Design a protein around this ligand. Structure first.
Ligand SMILES: Oc1ccnc2ccccc12
Length: 115
């Protein structure tokens, strides 16, 4: 409260570390569905069903231009990619499986790096 502050974690390396995690995700062999925005003109249903599209290139641009105020807003956008994937794809499809694999991969990096 006013004039009563918690010790807070050193956040000075957060930007660099999120960038490293994102690089590791960008170079994963199962990242291919998620590298660019889904083409809303070519994929029926996507625009109407998925209210907030997100992809790795869009996260990279936001990270490079100061659009994440903190590391938690970064994690929310990463998770959004995989939540969107689960919404639109059957678990037992190539894309569906890719999404589960990448979510697992991300969450371990996240825990190992920050928790
Ligand atoms: O949900 C998706 C994620 C990435 N790519 C996709 C390509 C076509 C149809 C759905 C997709």
């Amino acid at each position: 409260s006013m004039s009563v502050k918690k010790p807070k974690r050193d956040d000075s390396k957060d930007l660099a570390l999120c960038s490293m995690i994102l690089t590791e995700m960008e170079t994963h062999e199962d990242a291919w569905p998620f590298l660019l925005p889904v083409n809303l003109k070519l994929v029926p249903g996507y625009k109407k069903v998925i209210k907030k599209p997100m992809d790795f290139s869009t996260i990279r641009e936001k990270l490079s231009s100061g659009q994440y105020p903190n590391l938690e807003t970064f994690a929310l956008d990463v998770r959004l990619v995989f939540d969107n994937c689960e919404t639109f794809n059957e678990d037992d499809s190539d894309i569906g499986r890719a999404g589960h694999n990448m979510r697992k991969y991300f969450e371990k990096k996240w825990t190992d790096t920050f928790k």
